[PDB]
Amino acid sequence: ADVLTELPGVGPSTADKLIEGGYLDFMKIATATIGELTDIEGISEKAAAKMIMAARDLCDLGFKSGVELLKQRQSVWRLSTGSTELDTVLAGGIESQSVTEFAGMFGSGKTQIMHQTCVNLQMREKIFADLEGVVEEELEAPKAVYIDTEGTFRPERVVQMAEGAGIDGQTVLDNTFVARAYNSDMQMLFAEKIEDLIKGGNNIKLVIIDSLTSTFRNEFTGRGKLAERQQKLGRHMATLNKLADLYNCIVLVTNQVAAKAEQAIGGHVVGHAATFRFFLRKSKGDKRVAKLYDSPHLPDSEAVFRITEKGIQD
Ligand SMILES: Nc1ncnc2c1ncn2[C@@H]1O[C@H](COP(=O)(O)OP(=O)(O)NP(=O)(O)O)[C@@H](O)[C@H]1O
Ligand SMILES: [Mg+2]
Ligand SMILES: [Mg+2]
Structure with missing residues (x-):
């Protein structure tokens, strides 16, 4: 959802590095792999791994019943x-x-x-x-x-x-x-x-x-x-x-x-x-x-x- 800076751990600098790589939606990040995220300029594995879990959580991608x-x-x-x-x-x-x-x-x-x-x-x-x-x-x-x-x-x-x-x-x-x-x-x-x-x-x-x-x-x-x-x-x-x-x-x-x-x-x-x-x-x-x-x-x-x-x- 357009505003990536709403993602915990994601500041303005990162948000920019992300949009460049074609990531402009929460769901896209939540379904990404540490690999494809690290393929972007200065996005570390720890960060990549972190925003992925944060995106999933934000979109509430868990068990439903x-x-x-x-x-x-x-x-x-x-x-x-x-x-x-x-x-x-x-x-x-x-x-x-x-x-x-x-x-x-x-x-x-x-x-x-x-x-x-x-x-x-x-x-x-x-x-x-x-x-x-x-x-x-x-x-x-x-x-x-x-x-x-x-x-x-x-x-x-x-x-x-x-x-x-x-x-x-x-x-x-x-x-x-x-x-x-x-x-x-x-x-x-x-x-x-x-x-x-x-x-x-x-x-x-x-x-x-x-x-x-x-x-x-x-x-x-x-x-x-x-x-x-x-x-x-x-x-x-x-x-x-x-x-x-x-x-x-x-x-x-x-x-x-x-x-x-x-x-x-x-x-x-x-x-x-x-x-x-x-x-x-x-x-x-x-x-x-x-x-x-x-x-x-x-x-x-x-x-x-x-x-x-x-x-x-x-
Ligand atoms: N303007 C039209 N008025 C009435 N019928 C039409 C018109 N245009 C096409 N058709 C009909 O649509 C049929 C062909 O439809 P079409 O969607 O192209 O088939 P298709 O399954 O996709 N074949 P193909 O691409 O070879 O796999 C014709 O042979 C005509 O009877
Ligand atoms: Mg046809
Ligand atoms: Mg489907």
């Missing part, structure tokens, strides 16, 4: 997908503090959903938050980050969906950051640089990686390169899960499929890292089916939706 357990869950806000049936399967909508994955064959609607969420983020009526755990100013001027790894981001579609929702398309564009990544290195670096946007005053509440695996699959083709691929993708996923928890934001990813009748690629690393996993498939015409096949507390379920000129509906 009873009602406190429900309170923690109230800090999770949800975003509407534009589909009633889909939102119901999600038990409200897409959850912040988690990674939700949409995998499916070509044209199943993975990118459409990504675009719709950018629009919905700009409509508070589309955001469902418990006032008892999410302060309204935490939702003010929400911004989205779209890491486009295939080059399929379409400003036109965002504007069109915005119109379809009854709001200004230019407003959505002004509040949506897009980063075109040509390989996994850029993809991962962009994800890591999202912190700079937040530090810059942007309230990043939606992070989209479309596609999550296309780059990796094309860069590590040999089966004798499976381990290589998994390790890098694993670090990427960890970065994603941490920013989702740390900044109470939604992380949305898309995934392609492969035969054996099909399954999402990315291996176990993506399998374990994603909290919610969906399989998108096409039906008659503009109809689509979204099958939730993995989550920590929701049963497997299907939702029928459509992709139209307005965007996602039903």
